[PDB]
Design a protein around this ligand. Structure first.
Ligand SMILES: O=S(=O)(c1cccc2cnccc12)N1CCCNCC1
Lengths: 20, 353
């Protein structure tokens, strides 16, 4: 499912900006 | 047509009144922009309590003013680290913007000062924490709840864009919730005052507009794209474009395809297709009708824009508030000393601060 895909992405936590 | 005479006249008057408000707001902004305030407090006026957030930028600490007992959030930057990271201009510009703007959903800079080692921006303490935390905990926001927040961003961008400020840093991690449940925007390190186009690659992968990814010159329409990402993420609980690695995210963003949860209303999907529009000649917020294409969209039909601005709408969610100085809506961080050297560092670079 889309939600499962989100959890699998590893990008569920706070996201850094490009420069960081 | 869609509106009878009374509704059309009311909408027209409302839109003209926005113009009048924004004209006055620009006058006020420009006075402060051209003569910024400096050196309005000092470090020993405050007790350091707890670290609220840390990052490459530096730290934000909860502090208490010794005389009033009022709490504030103090952003502390090490001048030498700012120079090393090539952030002089961004740091000066962030403080200049914050001391010059005035809007109910933009955090207020109450004091600023510097010492031999550090720069300090003392802002109102916004005790509800990041939207991010609440969103991940609750999972997703109902459409009315998402709409309440979205309306505040729409008004905030209408204000900022009228000042020729592009924001470029929208995401739930950068939106705080205040004690009344309203949004506070705090981070202006990527904002830029520019009337036309600009070219810097900056932002967060999930929130980047296609024209940024594609190395185009771009304009304030990137903020309206980002609003679409935010509304989607608030209402779905996950953003419209994600993948294991940024390069994959960028491919989805530029593809012109977006998919929606089955619980999204048709009105929401229509708004999002018009904000998440790769074709700049078609993106809402970038057309002849400007912000009005967004404010007048069916998804916002129940929004009383003035009531939101006046903060007279009951928020759908109020963060827990145990009292002044309560930090329970923020994470816990290792506490580090605030070293002030006996020797001034980087004085010339930060004269304007
Ligand atoms: O929450 S902060 O530490 C913060 C910043 C500025 C003013 C604040 C006011 N109250 C609490 C936290 C505050 N934060 C740092 C960067 C990450 N994005 C959100 C803002």
């Amino acid at each position: 499912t889309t939600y499962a895909d989100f959890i699998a992405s590893g990008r569920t936590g706070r996201r850094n900006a490009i420069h960081d | 047509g869609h509106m009878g005479n009374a509704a059309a006249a009311k909408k027209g008057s409302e839109q003209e009144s926005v113009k009048e408000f924004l004209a006055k707001a620009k006058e006020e902004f420009l006075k402060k922009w051209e003569s910024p305030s400096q050196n309005t407090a000092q470090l020993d006026h405050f007790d350091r309590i707890k670290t609220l957030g840390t990052g490459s930028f530096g730290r934000v600490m909860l502090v208490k003013h010794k005389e009033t007992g009022n709490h504030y959030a103090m952003k502390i930057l090490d001048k030498q680290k700012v120079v090393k990271l090539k952030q002089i201009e961004h740091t000066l510009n962030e403080k200049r913007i914050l001391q010059a703007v005035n809007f109910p959903f933009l955090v207020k800079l109450e004091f600023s000062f510097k010492d031999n080692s550090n720069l300090y921006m003392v802002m109102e303490y916004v005790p509800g924490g990041e939207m991010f935390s609440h969103l991940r905990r609750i999972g997703r926001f109902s459409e009315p709840h998402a709409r309440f927040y979205a309306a505040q961003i729409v008004l905030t961008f209408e204000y900022l864009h009228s000042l020729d400020l592009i924001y470029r840093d929208l995401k739930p991690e950068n939106l705080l919730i205040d004690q009344q449940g309203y949004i506070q925007v705090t981070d202006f390190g990527f904002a830029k005052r520019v009337k036309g186009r600009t070219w810097t690659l900056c932002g967060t992968p999930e929130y980047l507009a296609p024209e940024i990814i594609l190395s185009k010159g771009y304009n304030k329409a990137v903020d309206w794209w980002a609003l679409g990402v935010l509304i989607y993420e608030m209402a779905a609980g996950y953003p419209p474009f994600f993948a294991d690695q940024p390069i994959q995210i960028y491919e989805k963003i530029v593809s012109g395809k977006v998919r929606f949860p089955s619980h999204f209303s048709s009105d929401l999907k229509d708004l999002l297709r018009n904000l998440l529009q790769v074709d700049l000649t078609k993106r809402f917020g970038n057309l002849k009708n400007g912000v009005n294409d967004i404010k007048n969209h069916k998804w916002f039909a129940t929004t009383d824009w003035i009531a939101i601005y006046q903060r007279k709408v009951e928020a759908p969610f109020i963060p827990k508030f145990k009292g002044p100085g309560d930090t329970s809506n923020f994470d816990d961080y290792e506490e580090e000393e605030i070293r002030v050297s006996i020797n001034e560092k980087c004085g010339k670079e930060f004269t304007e601060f």
